[PDB]
């Protein structure tokens, strides 16, 4: 939109998401495949037993990535570094657009309060309503990227 996710950003998100050939349970029962895909671009939901090629996974990932880029570009009104944009997209890829849009993160960010926004990454550590240690790690990493310059 304004910005797009950098190659480094994509590599980070991919490291968090993984790239899987077989549909798998994300931990809370949501069948996921490729690089974090749960809904194919045609609207079909991922199901247990699906398989996905590398090329398919890339297509699906890039399709969803563009959605989240659009959210960050449109919803954030404060200036962003590329690192900040990348971090916010990584977060949004996980929490979704609605969660991002209604977050205290975004409220602080749009006041120009970068530090307060950075710290708000850390609240997004839940899956299935439960704190998940992989998300705790991920949020810390996204926050670090957000603060990196």
Residue numbers in the entry: 48 to 196
Could you give the paper's own sentences about this structure?
The crystal structure of AcLys was refined to 1.2 Å resolution. There is one protein monomer is the asymmetric unit. The final model comprises one subunit of the protein (149 residues), 229 water molecules as well as sulfate and glycerol molecules. The first 47 N-terminal residues were not observed in electron density maps apparently due to high mobility of these residues or to limited proteolysis. The protein has overall α-helical architecture typical for lysozyme family, and is composed of seven α-helices: α2: residues 54–64, α3: 101–122, α4: 129–142, α5: 144–149, α6: 151–157, α7: 161–170 and α8: 180–193. Active site is formed by conserved catalytic triad: Glu64, Asp73 and Thr79 are clearly seen in the electron density. Glu64 forms salt bridge to conserved Arg185 which lies on the C-terminal helix α8. This salt bridge is a well-known feature of the known endolysins of P21 and P22 families. In case of AcLys the loop harbors an increased number of positively charged residues, including conserved Arg185, Arg186, Arg190 and Lys180 (also found in case of DLP12 endolysin from E. coli), unique Arg184—which is a part of positively charged patch consisting of three arginines, as well as Lys195 and Lys196. These residues surround the loop forming positive charge on their surface and thus could potentially bind and penetrate the cell membrane.
